[PDB]
Design brief:
part of a larger assembly, 2 chains, A: about 55 residues, mainly alpha, two-stranded antiparallel sheet, 2 strands, about 5% strand, B: about 50 residues, RNA-binding, DNA-directed RNA polymerase subunit (chain A)
RNA sequence: GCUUGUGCUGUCUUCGUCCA
């Protein structure tokens, strides 16, 4: 569909980052809280993006 | 009684399942952080599915 | 006049209960 599903949109060029409501953090004990799995995966993705940008230039 | 009754001693044993350890009710209470639905468990004042 | 105290993880695993 030209308006809604264009074929080139199947390739990701910009990634949407969900709000913390989607990936809430949990307090494992009284002091240390735990980052969610999605948060760690997004951190890894962003590190890889930074690495690619640094290497390219 | 018009009917005679079978009558005698028998060995009975009390099992761990008592009603006061199973009765549970909930009007409102804690909810999960991710889904904002009632938590699971009688010990946690949870809801029924 | 000294004025009262509100908040709970999460993920696995196991063992059970009632039907089947």
């Amino acid at each position: 569909n030209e308006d809604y599903a264009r074929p080139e949109w199947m390739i990701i060029t910009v990634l949407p980052v969900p709000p913390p409501q989607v990936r809430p953090s949990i307090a494992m004990d009284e002091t240390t809280q735990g980052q969610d799995d999605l948060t760690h995966k997004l951190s890894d993705i962003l590190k890889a993006n930074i690495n690619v940008q640094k290497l390219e230039m | 009684l018009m009917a005679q009754v079978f009558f005698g001693p028998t060995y009975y044993q009390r099992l761990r399942h008592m009603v006061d350890d199973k009765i549970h009710a909930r009007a409102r209470g804690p909810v999960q952080v991710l889904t904002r639905q009632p938590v699971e468990g009688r010990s946690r004042d949870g809801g029924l599915r």
